C-alpha cells in the first residue's frame, strides 16, 4: 500500500557511520561477558551498523541476544533497533526480522511505528499475508496503534485475511477481535466504528464460550465481563448519535450470528471470578438479543447501514488517507534521523573523554 518513497532507504544508507571490523568488535563484547562486565550501547550499535553480509546478520542476532541478557539491556537505542530491521530487509533476511520481533522478550527488538510499517509493507507487496498478519498481532500485543499510517495498514491486512478465513479458532477470534478493536478505536470513520463492533463481537463469543479469562489473559484487554454489552453500545451509540455515522452491514450480520450461536449452543486454576450478586453473562443473553433487534431496526430505519463490504470500504479509506500520512510520517522520519545522529555523536564523544581520563588514571597509578 505504501509508496516507494516511504520504503526508500537512501536516507538511512546515507547516515554517518563509523567503520569497525566486526571481528574486532566481537572480541570486545566476548571479553566483557566472560568477565561479567557491562557492555556499552554504543558497542552493540556499532556492530549492527557495520553489518556487511547475510552471514553477519546471524552473528549480530547472537550479540543482540547477549545484549538483552546483560546489565545494560534497557539502553538499547532506538536507531539500533531501526537499523536492525533496515539491515534485515537489505540482505533478504525478512524471516529473521519477524523472528526477533516475535521473540522480543529474548532479543529486545521493540520497533517504532515507522519501522513496523516498513516490515509490514514488505510482506504485503510480496503477497505473504500470513507473515504480515504476524506483524499486526505483534503491533497489537505492544498496543502500538498510535500513528494513523499504522492503523490504515493494520485494518487492511486484518479485513483481507478475515475474508479468506471462513473458519476461525478461538485463539484466532481472540487475536483478530483484539486487533480490530484497538485499531478501530483510533479511527472515527465508518471503517473505524465497524471494526469496533466487529472486534467486540468476536471477543464476546470467546467470553461466553470459554470464559472471560480467555479474552484478557495475556492480552491487552480488560477483565470486566460484558463484551457483548460493549458491542451493543456501539450500535446504540451510532443509532442515537446526532451526527450521521454508519455501520457496515457485514458487521451487523456477524453480531447476529454470534448472539444466535451463544444463545442456542449444542491444576487448581478453576475459580469463580465474579460476585454472586452480579448477573452472569449467560443469563443476560435474552435481553441482549432484544436490544440487537431494536437497534438494527432503528439503524435501518435511519438508513445508517452501509451495504458495501468492509474490505471495500477499508480499501477506499486507505487510498484516500494513506497518501497524506506518508508525507507526515516521512517528515517525522527525517527529524528522527537527525535527532539520532546528534545523540550518537554525544555518546561517541563521551566514550572518548572517559578513555582519555583512563590513561590519566593509569599515569597517576
Amino acid at each position: 500500500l505504501l509508496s516507494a518513497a516511504y520504503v526508500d532507504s537512501h536516507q538511512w544508507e546515507a547516515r554517518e557511520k563509523e567503520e569497525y571490523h566486526l571481528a574486532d568488535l566481537a572480541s570486545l563484547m566476548d571479553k566483557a561477558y566472560e568477565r561479567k562486565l557491562p557492555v556499552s550501547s554504543l558497542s552493540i550499535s556499532r556492530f549492527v551498523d557495520n553489518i556487511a553480509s547475510r552471514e553477519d546478520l546471524d552473528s549480530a542476532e547472537y550479540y543482540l541476544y547477549k545484549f538483552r541478557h546483560s546489565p545494560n539491556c534497557w539502553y538499547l537505542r532506538d536507531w539500533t533497533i531501526h537499523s536492525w530491521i533496515r539491515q534485515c530487509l537489505k540482505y533478504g533476511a525478512q524471516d529473521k526480522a519477524l523472528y526477533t520481533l516475535v521473540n522480543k522478550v529474548q532479543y529486545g527488538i521493540f520497533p517504532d511505528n515507522f519501522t513496523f510499517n516498513l516490515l509490514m509493507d514488505y510482506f504485503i507487496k510480496k503477497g505473504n499475508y500470513k507473515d504480515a498478519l504476524s506483524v499486526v498481532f505483534e503491533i497489537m500485543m505492544q498496543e502500538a496503534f498510535d500513528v494513523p499510517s499504522t492503523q490504515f495498514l493494520s485494518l487492511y491486512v486484518l479485513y483481507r485475511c478475515l475474508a479468506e478465513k471462513t473458519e476461525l479458532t478461538w485463539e484466532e477470534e481472540r487475536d483478530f477481535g483484539a486487533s480490530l478493536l484497538l485499531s478501530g478505536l483510533k479511527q472515527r470513520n465508518t471503517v473505524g466504528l465497524s471494526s469496533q463492533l466487529y472486534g467486540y463481537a468476536l471477543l464476546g463469543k470467546v467470553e461466553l464460550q470459554r470464559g472471560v479469562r480467555a479474552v484478557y489473559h495475556g492480552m491487552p484487554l480488560m477483565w470486566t465481563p460484558g463484551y457483548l454489552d460493549r458491542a451493543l453500545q456501539v450500535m446504540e451509540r451510532v443509532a442515537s448519535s446526532p451526527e450521521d455515522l454508519k455501520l457496515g452491514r457485514e458487521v451487523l450480520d456477524v453480531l447476529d450470528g454470534v448472539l444466535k450461536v451463544v444463545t442456542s449452543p449444542d491444576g487448581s486454576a478453576n475459580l469463580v471470578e465474579q460476585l454472586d450478586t452480579e448477573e452472569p453473562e449467560q443469563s443476560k443473553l435474552p435481553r441482549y438479543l432484544e436490544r440487537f433487534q431494536a437497534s438494527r431496526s432503528k439503524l435501518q430505519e435511519l438508513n445508517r447501514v452501509e451495504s458495501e463490504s468492509l474490505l471495500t470500504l477499508t480499501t477506499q479509506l486507505v487510498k484516500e488517507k494513506l497518501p497524506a500520512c506518508e508525507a507526515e510520517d516521512l517528515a517525522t522520519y527525517e527529524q528522527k534521523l537527525r535527532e539520532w545522529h546528534l545523540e550518537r555523536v554525544q555518546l561517541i564523544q563521551r566514550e572518548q573523554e572517559q578513555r582519555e581520563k583512563a590513561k590519566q588514571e593509569y599515569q597517576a597509578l
Partner: protein, 34 residues
Amino acid sequence: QPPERELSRLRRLYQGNLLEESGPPPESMPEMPT
C-alpha cells in the same frame, strides 16, 4: 449486619472453604436448659 455486597466478596475470596452464614445472634443469653 454486613452489607450484602461484602458478604459476596468474602464468599469469592474463600470459595471452597466456607461455613454456613450466621445471622444476628440472640438478643439476650438463652436461659440454660435444665
